Amino acid sequence: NNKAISTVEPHYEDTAPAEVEPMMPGSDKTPKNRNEKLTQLDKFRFAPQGESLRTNQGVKISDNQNSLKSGARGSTLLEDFILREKITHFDHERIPERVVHARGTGAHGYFQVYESLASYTTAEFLQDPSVKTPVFVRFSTVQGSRGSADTVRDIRGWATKFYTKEGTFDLVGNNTPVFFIQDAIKFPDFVHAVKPEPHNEIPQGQSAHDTFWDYISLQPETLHNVMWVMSDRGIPRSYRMMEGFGIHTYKMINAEGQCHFIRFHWKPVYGVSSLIWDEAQLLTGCDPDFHRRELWESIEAGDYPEYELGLQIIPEEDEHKFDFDILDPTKLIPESLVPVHLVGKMVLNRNPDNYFSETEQVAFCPGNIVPGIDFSDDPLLQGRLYSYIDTQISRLGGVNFHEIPINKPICPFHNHQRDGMHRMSISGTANYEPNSINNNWPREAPPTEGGFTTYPQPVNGYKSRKRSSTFIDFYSQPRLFWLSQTKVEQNHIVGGFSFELGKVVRPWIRERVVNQLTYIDHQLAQSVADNLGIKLSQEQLKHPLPGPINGLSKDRSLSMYDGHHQILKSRQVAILAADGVCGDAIDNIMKTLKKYGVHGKIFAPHVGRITSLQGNEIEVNGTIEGNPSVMVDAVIIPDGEDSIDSLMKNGNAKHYVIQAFKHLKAIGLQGKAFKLYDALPLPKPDEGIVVGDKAADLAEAFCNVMRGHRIWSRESVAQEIAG
Amino acid sequence: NKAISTVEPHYEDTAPAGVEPMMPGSDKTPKNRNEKLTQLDKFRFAPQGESLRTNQGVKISDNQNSLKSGARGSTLLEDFILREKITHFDHERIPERVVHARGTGAHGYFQVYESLASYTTAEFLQDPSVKTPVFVRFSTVQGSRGSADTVRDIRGWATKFYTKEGTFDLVGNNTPVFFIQDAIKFPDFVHAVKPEPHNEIPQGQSAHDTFWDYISLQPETLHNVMWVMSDRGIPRSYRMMEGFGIHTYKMINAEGQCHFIRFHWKPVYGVSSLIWDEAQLLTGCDPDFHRRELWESIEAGDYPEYELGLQIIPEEDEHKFDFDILDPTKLIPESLVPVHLVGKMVLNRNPDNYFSETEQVAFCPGNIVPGIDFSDDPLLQGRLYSYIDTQISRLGGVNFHEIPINKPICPFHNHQRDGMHRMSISGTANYEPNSINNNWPREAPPTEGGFTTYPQPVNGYKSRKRSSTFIDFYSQPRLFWLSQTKVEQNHIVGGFSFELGKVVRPWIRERVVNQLTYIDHQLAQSVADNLGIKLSQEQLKHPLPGPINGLSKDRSLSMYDGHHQILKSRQVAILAADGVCGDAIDNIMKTLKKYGVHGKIFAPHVGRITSLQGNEIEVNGTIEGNPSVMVDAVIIPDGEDSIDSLMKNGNAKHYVIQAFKHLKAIGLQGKAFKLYDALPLPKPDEGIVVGDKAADLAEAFCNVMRGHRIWSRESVAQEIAG
Ligand code: HEM
Ligand code: HEM
């Protein structure tokens, strides 16, 4: 009554209750994680504690619940400037999404070099190991719009902004070492092919449709990066557990004018780990924010994303020594031939305060580079230089987007540029160079004092539109990639191809792709052709295959699961429990998990607390229904007679074990919890099943099984299970 | 050579020398024509035999390479072809709509059954011979452009009527009420339901803290929360949901008589919904399910069909109800005021280009025509200023009416000039009154059709204040609750319990169920239990609202009470492998075809399977790529070899378990029961149809399907692991 009426009257009272945790802005949750960039952004942060609600002109608002009307039942008056300003700001909140990589996630951190790279570059942020260079990273997918799901099969973008004392350096990479195309002129064609089709805008976040594969079949240059995205690299488990690549060959110029060709790498301290397809798909349905959320909670937990910056270094005289052109972006440089030197460390240790201000409005370009780094003649990179700044003029509202806080450098940046939309700087001095009325300040900087110069590379040829003959080589590296994959990874590649072409309606497109696969590997083609009902002619089964690359038929560095570099720390475990559960078994599991930095979450039939058979309340993390097995790495079911009975009448709790089994995950069953597995149509316990009566001992064995990531041996029987 | 060819200019042919792919509407249904579509032909491009050119008309010889300083050199700034191709691509994107960003569009027409001159002078409602063109966009609310179709959300429903007396936009939703009463709260409500601003989580979901925090503090939202928590929030198709303009409008007739009006759309294909677990899985394996369903249904001839209905109230009965008809959180119960079906709308042509037509279409509630008018509903009043304001940024300026999909098909002369991308070239005087052009174009007198506002009396004081008569938050939620079948009530409890499960701060969940105790004590207790909340004795005694003009239920607010289930156009999976019974499929298909139902053969691989009779039969797609959640029901024909392979296949055994848990009809012919009996599934209930003869098993199968879902199965479905 009075309580009812009060909700639609001005709210002058406290609303919060009188006084495990939700996600919060980084300033709230990790204020002790600072850097120079974050300190610069503080000038723009708002502390509204104890402030009046106001208009943008600073007028206190007395009634935020009602429009100005002519009678409390009347027509709204045009003179309600508060209503119109509030609605008008609302009406204009949206800006264009990125034309590609629209779906992204940001975090702040810092970078340090291990020791001076002055033997190879003058670049300031690689000279001094004591400097902490602030960074901001945006991870992304490629195909989908804002609001598409995270765990699609797709390439992942990886864009790092280095706020150095001598300029902002943008390393704009992907999570695979090659790209689909060789020349930038094909990029709108390729992108249009993979994007939703123009008549119906179908499908979202997916390459599994006609026009993408039509384009692949007609442009063999794409086959290499298709193999990468068709592998499990196409569905990583976390942005903390994938590799990063600059793809293009850059140049690094040292203080002696010498040039070294270089390729950029990010190696993850937490290993390289991926989902499997069926699990990646179900995750898009039940948590489209899975990667965004995982990254966010990673930082709040102190499991900071941590990556080592690696360089491949090739002397100028060595440019032409490989079977491939090192300026070809569909070619990787196998790490067997040119090792990766780890030269520094990046840590992401603080989430943003405002997604839109920081992550949405950030602007990265390959062209922003700093003295000591320079471009190569890669024709894809050369085209990128012009696109990033062009697109951002309309995405971010004009030529002054570097004045938006997240984009500003931390060093001076005086010049003679003036005006443009939303000009924030205010300049009084002469706006032309050379001038004498200001004694020509600001002034050009000699190269020996840090002024950018281009390396004087020789240029000889004719003005020409032509693909380099040194680029015509489309199958060598797809075949190298294939042969470096373990048996399971090859099977999943076959699954990627077979699932995707399965969604292509036009039959000639599937046959044209399968025909391209016969030039990569005959068994790969045969396996895919079988899943599609295609019969391969005797000719196709004899098609010529490429030979080794500079002596190499394999390179283990291209396999995710051969290197045995799986990391246990920071993984997520479901503890299925209900009322009547053994409280001390849970307590001992949580000690063993925390010992190895693993995160156990109690999932129950309802939120709140459950009561252990010892009568203590145990906090719940979520419900079994809202937290499917696809959201965790392994499942442990502790004991408690009444807990198990309850879990056996819950189809979700039982499906939890069938699903986790089919996704090759480790399952621990303490004591009478084995009844659940038994009830299910599940075969004999394999290596990935850990049964035991004492909790701390079950959990130790359970963690050791987790060290293998997935139980690949199980894959054949797992297919048979109805789940 | 084959390889070299692909990186050189492509002067040769590339074409080779359900069953068919989705295509532009101009290619598949060219015979479905209307006046707006003929106007759009003026802007269609036919590229057969044409050269690839720049935008200035210059022929391009090599679309494969940048201009370089040599074949391995540096790209040249003078390559204008490269820069023009890249620049256009760089600026393809325009802002998404601030709400309803995620949407699907189709063309069609509308006919009035008989003249409505008794009520309105609106030209498109006068003459039943006219086919007045329309364009409809369906949408969700919360999610951005690439979010899933089958989220739990309100669905937007926007119809543009291209009439000869102006373009009229009917911009409504699929539930008869909105969340809030005054437009000034729209940014607050929308911010609360949208992803939260620090992390931009979560997408296409209200299941998070800020949304329920807002609900808990704004009881006026509760009524439409009930609607979204019910199965209304997850419809099966845009063809099977209802539509409402929600606001009370006005219709004025030739005599100057005013009637209050509320708009309705009633689906000829009935009102059907998904269930929550099936909706959520559908967003994983097909985020485009509704967009695809609408497109294919039009290419198949199952044209969406809706009847435009009107609740009509004489201006004198404005105050005859226990609620304010100006309150957009209130519906008018169809018992109290029946809905008159006044005409039909059919959607029968897909667009040619999604971006040109669906993305660029602009609809505003302020786009009315002579014969319709506004009421003093304070939410509608704010909407009049917002639609046009936002379209200036989203669509590039004030000339967005000149974009083809947005143009009227009547004349539209005035004195407006310039603006960004001005298309028309106007030679005459640009002010009124003028003499140098004898004042053309001229004002139209009302008796010749010039718009006038009905002279409604206006009295009071300039004030910011919620009308006393708007302060009724709990009565219509209760009406809606008591009007639901038992299974629909359970599903509402499900929505509340799942959603509040994702809320982190406990006090928000507690404050929300506390609000539920003022709607129905047993709804509050069910939801409180699912969340571990113990209700106090005081809470359990909380006063409940009485009836509304003597009404305690209204059957029309229920989906599954008045048997609104249509069978025509449903989708049936047919699980077949190599070794299936040929004659069975034929007789299944002939039976399904007899009823307007589409059956789709799903096999382990794509292409063809061979029957035990040795013939080949076309597959529609894999079992793996088309889970049970995409079809209305499953049928498994016989064929010992088919059954044997299916039983080795995890997906096909799960197909039936999942079909079962989602309460769908499962047909099993012959030894197909071999497969059912192998799974942990109970004895065949009323929605499990066995039989050895296909036509009979199909006929009985199609008749279980008429009930939409086996609601009885619900209790045993919960315990099935799957
Ligand atoms: C080596 C292959 C390429 C890689 C690894 C790459 C990487 C990326 C990444 C990671 C982003 C997202 C940056 C962010 O988070 O804001 C991006 C955006 C973009 N890229 Fe690429 N890209 C490549 C090729 C191309 C090409 C060939 C073009 C066209 C010439 C292009 C044009 C763009 C544009 C316009 C954007 C959006 C920029 C913005 O709106 O801020 N990229 N690229
Ligand atoms: C009765 C409750 C409301 C309903 C049924 C409603 C319905 C809709 C629908 C269906 C759309 C999508 C139209 C399309 O497909 O393009 C939409 C968009 C929009 N609405 Fe509402 N709305 C309501 C209340 C509001 C309010 C209170 C405001 C703010 C004053 C508002 C502002 C907008 C804006 C700015 C758009 C985007 C328009 C565009 O970008 O073209 N609406 N509304």
Short mmCIF file of C-alpha atoms in Angstrom, two decimals, chain A residues 41-313:
data_model
loop_
_atom_site.label_atom_id
_atom_site.label_comp_id
_atom_site.label_asym_id
_atom_site.label_seq_id
_atom_site.Cartn_x
_atom_site.Cartn_y
_atom_site.Cartn_z
CA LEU A 41 42.65 5.92 -16.59
CA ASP A 42 41.86 6.87 -12.98
CA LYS A 43 41.37 10.49 -14.06
CA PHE A 44 38.22 9.25 -15.85
CA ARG A 45 36.66 7.01 -13.18
CA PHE A 46 33.49 8.06 -11.36
CA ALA A 47 32.88 7.70 -7.62
CA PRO A 48 29.09 8.19 -7.23
CA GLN A 49 28.99 7.37 -3.51
CA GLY A 50 26.79 10.00 -1.90
CA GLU A 51 26.13 11.91 -5.12
CA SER A 52 22.86 13.33 -6.39
CA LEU A 53 21.42 11.91 -9.59
CA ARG A 54 21.96 14.68 -12.13
CA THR A 55 21.58 15.58 -15.76
CA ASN A 56 24.65 15.87 -17.97
CA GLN A 57 24.51 19.63 -17.33
CA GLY A 58 24.74 19.01 -13.57
CA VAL A 59 21.12 19.69 -12.55
CA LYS A 60 19.91 17.61 -9.59
CA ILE A 61 16.98 15.36 -10.53
CA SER A 62 14.16 15.18 -7.96
CA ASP A 63 11.87 12.59 -9.56
CA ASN A 64 13.40 9.86 -11.74
CA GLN A 65 10.11 7.90 -11.79
CA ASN A 66 7.73 10.06 -13.82
CA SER A 67 7.53 12.13 -16.97
CA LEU A 68 6.23 15.70 -16.80
CA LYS A 69 2.54 15.47 -17.70
CA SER A 70 -0.54 17.73 -17.86
CA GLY A 71 -2.33 16.08 -14.97
CA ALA A 72 -1.17 12.86 -13.30
CA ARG A 73 -3.22 11.02 -15.96
CA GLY A 74 -2.46 13.37 -18.86
CA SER A 75 -0.27 13.87 -21.93
CA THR A 76 3.50 14.12 -21.66
CA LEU A 77 4.80 17.65 -22.19
CA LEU A 78 7.61 18.54 -24.61
CA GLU A 79 9.19 20.74 -21.93
CA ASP A 80 10.34 17.68 -19.94
CA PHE A 81 14.02 18.13 -20.72
CA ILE A 82 15.03 15.51 -18.12
CA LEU A 83 12.99 12.80 -19.83
CA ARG A 84 14.23 13.71 -23.29
CA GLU A 85 17.90 13.88 -22.31
CA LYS A 86 17.75 10.54 -20.49
CA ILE A 87 15.89 8.82 -23.38
CA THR A 88 18.11 10.51 -25.98
CA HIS A 89 21.29 9.25 -24.40
CA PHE A 90 19.72 5.79 -24.26
CA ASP A 91 18.69 5.97 -27.95
CA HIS A 92 22.31 6.62 -29.01
CA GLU A 93 24.25 4.10 -26.89
CA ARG A 94 25.17 1.75 -29.73
CA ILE A 95 28.14 2.19 -32.03
CA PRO A 96 29.01 -0.14 -34.95
CA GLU A 97 30.50 -3.50 -34.04
CA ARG A 98 33.89 -4.50 -35.45
CA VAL A 99 33.52 -5.71 -39.02
CA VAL A 100 35.36 -8.89 -37.92
CA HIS A 101 36.21 -10.05 -34.38
CA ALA A 102 33.08 -8.32 -33.07
CA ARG A 103 32.86 -10.75 -30.13
CA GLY A 104 35.64 -9.97 -27.68
CA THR A 105 36.88 -9.79 -24.11
CA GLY A 106 39.42 -7.42 -22.55
CA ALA A 107 41.87 -7.37 -19.67
CA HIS A 108 44.73 -5.17 -18.43
CA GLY A 109 48.19 -6.38 -17.53
CA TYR A 110 51.89 -5.70 -18.00
CA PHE A 111 54.89 -7.03 -19.93
CA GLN A 112 58.57 -7.36 -19.01
CA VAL A 113 61.52 -8.31 -21.18
CA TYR A 114 63.89 -10.95 -19.75
CA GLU A 115 67.00 -9.17 -20.99
CA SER A 116 67.92 -6.51 -23.51
CA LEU A 117 67.22 -7.34 -27.15
CA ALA A 118 69.59 -4.53 -28.27
CA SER A 119 71.47 -7.09 -30.38
CA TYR A 120 68.32 -7.29 -32.55
CA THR A 121 66.17 -4.16 -31.98
CA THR A 122 66.25 -0.63 -30.65
CA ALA A 123 62.63 -0.93 -29.54
CA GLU A 124 62.49 0.74 -26.13
CA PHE A 125 60.18 -1.76 -24.43
CA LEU A 126 62.59 -4.62 -25.22
CA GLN A 127 65.72 -2.91 -23.81
CA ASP A 128 65.28 -2.71 -20.04
CA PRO A 129 64.23 -5.77 -17.99
CA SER A 130 63.13 -3.63 -15.02
CA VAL A 131 60.44 -1.69 -16.94
CA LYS A 132 56.87 -2.94 -16.60
CA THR A 133 55.15 -1.97 -19.85
CA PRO A 134 51.38 -1.71 -19.38
CA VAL A 135 49.29 -3.77 -21.80
CA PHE A 136 45.65 -4.25 -22.68
CA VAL A 137 44.62 -7.47 -24.42
CA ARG A 138 41.41 -8.24 -26.29
CA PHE A 139 40.66 -11.86 -27.14
CA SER A 140 38.00 -12.50 -29.74
CA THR A 141 36.34 -14.84 -32.20
CA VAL A 142 36.21 -13.83 -35.91
CA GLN A 143 32.91 -14.71 -37.61
CA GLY A 144 30.17 -13.86 -35.13
CA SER A 145 28.51 -10.58 -34.18
CA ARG A 146 28.21 -9.14 -30.72
CA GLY A 147 26.17 -11.67 -28.81
CA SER A 148 27.36 -14.73 -30.68
CA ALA A 149 28.69 -17.52 -28.47
CA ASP A 150 32.26 -17.94 -27.21
CA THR A 151 32.90 -21.64 -27.79
CA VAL A 152 32.16 -21.70 -31.53
CA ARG A 153 34.57 -23.47 -33.86
CA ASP A 154 36.59 -20.54 -35.13
CA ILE A 155 39.92 -18.72 -35.20
CA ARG A 156 40.58 -16.65 -32.07
CA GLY A 157 42.02 -13.18 -32.36
CA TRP A 158 44.64 -11.98 -29.91
CA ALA A 159 45.44 -8.28 -29.81
CA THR A 160 48.00 -6.84 -27.39
CA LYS A 161 48.48 -3.08 -26.92
CA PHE A 162 51.88 -2.13 -25.43
CA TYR A 163 51.95 1.36 -23.92
CA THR A 164 55.65 1.99 -24.32
CA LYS A 165 57.52 5.18 -23.50
CA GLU A 166 58.26 5.61 -27.24
CA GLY A 167 54.84 4.92 -28.74
CA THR A 168 51.96 2.48 -28.49
CA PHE A 169 52.81 -0.88 -30.10
CA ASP A 170 49.92 -3.07 -31.28
CA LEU A 171 50.66 -6.77 -31.90
CA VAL A 172 47.43 -7.91 -33.57
CA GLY A 173 47.56 -11.70 -33.88
CA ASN A 174 45.47 -14.89 -34.02
CA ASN A 175 45.75 -18.20 -32.15
CA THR A 176 46.97 -20.13 -35.23
CA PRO A 177 50.30 -19.49 -37.01
CA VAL A 178 48.95 -18.91 -40.54
CA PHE A 179 46.07 -17.13 -42.21
CA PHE A 180 43.57 -18.21 -44.87
CA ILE A 181 44.69 -15.90 -47.66
CA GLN A 182 47.84 -14.50 -49.21
CA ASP A 183 46.80 -11.07 -50.54
CA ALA A 184 44.66 -8.48 -48.71
CA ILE A 185 42.53 -7.90 -51.83
CA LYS A 186 40.81 -11.27 -51.13
CA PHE A 187 39.84 -10.38 -47.55
CA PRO A 188 36.29 -9.06 -48.21
CA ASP A 189 35.70 -12.11 -50.41
CA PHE A 190 36.92 -14.56 -47.76
CA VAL A 191 35.06 -12.73 -44.97
CA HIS A 192 31.84 -12.54 -46.98
CA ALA A 193 32.18 -16.28 -47.60
CA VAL A 194 32.43 -17.22 -43.92
CA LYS A 195 29.98 -14.58 -42.60
CA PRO A 196 26.24 -15.31 -42.46
CA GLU A 197 24.90 -15.44 -46.00
CA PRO A 198 23.49 -12.17 -47.36
CA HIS A 199 19.91 -13.26 -48.16
CA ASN A 200 18.92 -14.75 -44.74
CA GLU A 201 21.86 -13.90 -42.38
CA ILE A 202 22.32 -17.61 -41.53
CA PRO A 203 24.38 -19.06 -39.82
CA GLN A 204 25.81 -17.24 -36.80
CA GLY A 205 29.23 -18.07 -35.38
CA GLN A 206 29.74 -20.92 -37.87
CA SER A 207 31.68 -21.72 -41.01
CA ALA A 208 29.53 -24.82 -41.61
CA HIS A 209 27.61 -23.54 -44.61
CA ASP A 210 27.72 -23.49 -48.39
CA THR A 211 29.46 -20.24 -49.26
CA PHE A 212 32.43 -20.69 -46.93
CA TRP A 213 33.20 -24.14 -48.30
CA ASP A 214 32.49 -23.00 -51.86
CA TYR A 215 35.24 -20.45 -51.37
CA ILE A 216 37.63 -22.98 -49.75
CA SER A 217 37.19 -25.44 -52.61
CA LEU A 218 38.08 -22.75 -55.17
CA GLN A 219 41.01 -21.22 -53.22
CA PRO A 220 43.43 -24.02 -52.16
CA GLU A 221 45.60 -21.41 -50.43
CA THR A 222 43.02 -21.56 -47.60
CA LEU A 223 43.52 -25.28 -46.91
CA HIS A 224 46.32 -24.79 -44.39
CA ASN A 225 44.38 -22.58 -41.97
CA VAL A 226 41.24 -24.63 -42.54
CA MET A 227 43.14 -27.64 -41.16
CA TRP A 228 44.05 -25.58 -38.10
CA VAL A 229 40.48 -24.44 -37.47
CA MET A 230 39.08 -27.95 -38.22
CA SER A 231 41.42 -29.35 -35.56
CA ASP A 232 40.76 -28.92 -31.85
CA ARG A 233 42.72 -25.66 -32.04
CA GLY A 234 39.39 -24.36 -33.38
CA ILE A 235 37.78 -24.75 -29.94
CA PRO A 236 40.21 -23.90 -27.10
CA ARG A 237 39.22 -24.38 -23.49
CA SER A 238 40.40 -21.01 -22.35
CA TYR A 239 42.13 -17.88 -23.67
CA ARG A 240 44.77 -18.78 -21.06
CA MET A 241 45.34 -22.11 -22.84
CA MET A 242 46.03 -21.32 -26.45
CA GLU A 243 49.06 -20.14 -28.39
CA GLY A 244 49.30 -16.78 -30.10
CA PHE A 245 50.98 -15.78 -33.36
CA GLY A 246 51.63 -12.55 -35.21
CA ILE A 247 51.58 -14.67 -38.41
CA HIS A 248 53.42 -12.08 -40.50
CA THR A 249 57.16 -11.79 -40.72
CA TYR A 250 58.19 -8.41 -39.31
CA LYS A 251 61.63 -6.75 -39.31
CA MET A 252 63.69 -5.75 -36.27
CA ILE A 253 66.37 -3.11 -36.76
CA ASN A 254 69.23 -2.79 -34.28
CA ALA A 255 71.28 0.27 -33.43
CA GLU A 256 73.77 -0.76 -36.14
CA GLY A 257 71.16 -0.58 -38.91
CA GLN A 258 71.14 -4.38 -39.26
CA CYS A 259 67.90 -6.19 -40.06
CA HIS A 260 66.60 -9.50 -38.69
CA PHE A 261 63.34 -11.04 -39.98
CA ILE A 262 61.19 -11.99 -36.98
CA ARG A 263 57.91 -13.84 -36.24
CA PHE A 264 56.01 -13.18 -32.96
CA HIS A 265 54.76 -15.94 -30.64
CA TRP A 266 52.89 -16.12 -27.33
CA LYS A 267 53.45 -19.36 -25.38
CA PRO A 268 50.93 -19.97 -22.58
CA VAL A 269 52.26 -20.80 -19.13
CA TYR A 270 49.03 -22.76 -18.50
CA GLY A 271 49.54 -25.02 -21.52
CA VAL A 272 47.53 -25.57 -24.66
CA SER A 273 44.18 -27.29 -24.06
CA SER A 274 40.97 -27.61 -26.04
CA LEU A 275 37.37 -28.69 -25.78
CA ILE A 276 35.91 -31.45 -27.92
CA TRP A 277 33.30 -30.57 -30.47
CA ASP A 278 30.16 -32.02 -28.91
CA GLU A 279 31.08 -30.35 -25.61
CA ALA A 280 31.97 -27.04 -27.28
CA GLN A 281 28.55 -27.00 -28.91
CA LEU A 282 26.48 -27.71 -25.77
CA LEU A 283 28.47 -24.99 -24.01
CA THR A 284 27.41 -22.38 -26.60
CA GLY A 285 23.83 -23.19 -25.64
CA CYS A 286 24.10 -23.13 -21.88
CA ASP A 287 26.91 -20.56 -21.42
CA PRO A 288 27.58 -18.38 -24.46
CA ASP A 289 29.81 -16.24 -22.17
CA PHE A 290 31.99 -19.21 -21.16
CA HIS A 291 35.36 -17.80 -22.32
CA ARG A 292 34.60 -14.20 -21.33
CA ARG A 293 33.52 -15.48 -17.88
CA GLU A 294 36.46 -17.87 -17.48
CA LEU A 295 38.94 -15.07 -18.21
CA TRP A 296 37.16 -12.68 -15.84
CA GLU A 297 37.02 -15.15 -12.92
CA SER A 298 40.59 -16.24 -13.64
CA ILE A 299 41.79 -12.73 -12.73
CA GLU A 300 39.51 -12.44 -9.70
CA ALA A 301 40.90 -15.81 -8.52
CA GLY A 302 44.58 -14.91 -9.02
CA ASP A 303 45.05 -17.53 -11.73
CA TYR A 304 46.38 -14.68 -13.90
CA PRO A 305 46.70 -15.38 -17.64
CA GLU A 306 50.42 -15.60 -18.23
CA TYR A 307 52.22 -15.83 -21.54
CA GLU A 308 55.83 -15.74 -22.71
CA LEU A 309 56.59 -13.58 -25.76
CA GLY A 310 58.63 -15.69 -28.20
CA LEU A 311 60.53 -14.57 -31.30
CA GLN A 312 61.66 -16.57 -34.33
CA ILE A 313 64.83 -14.81 -35.52
#
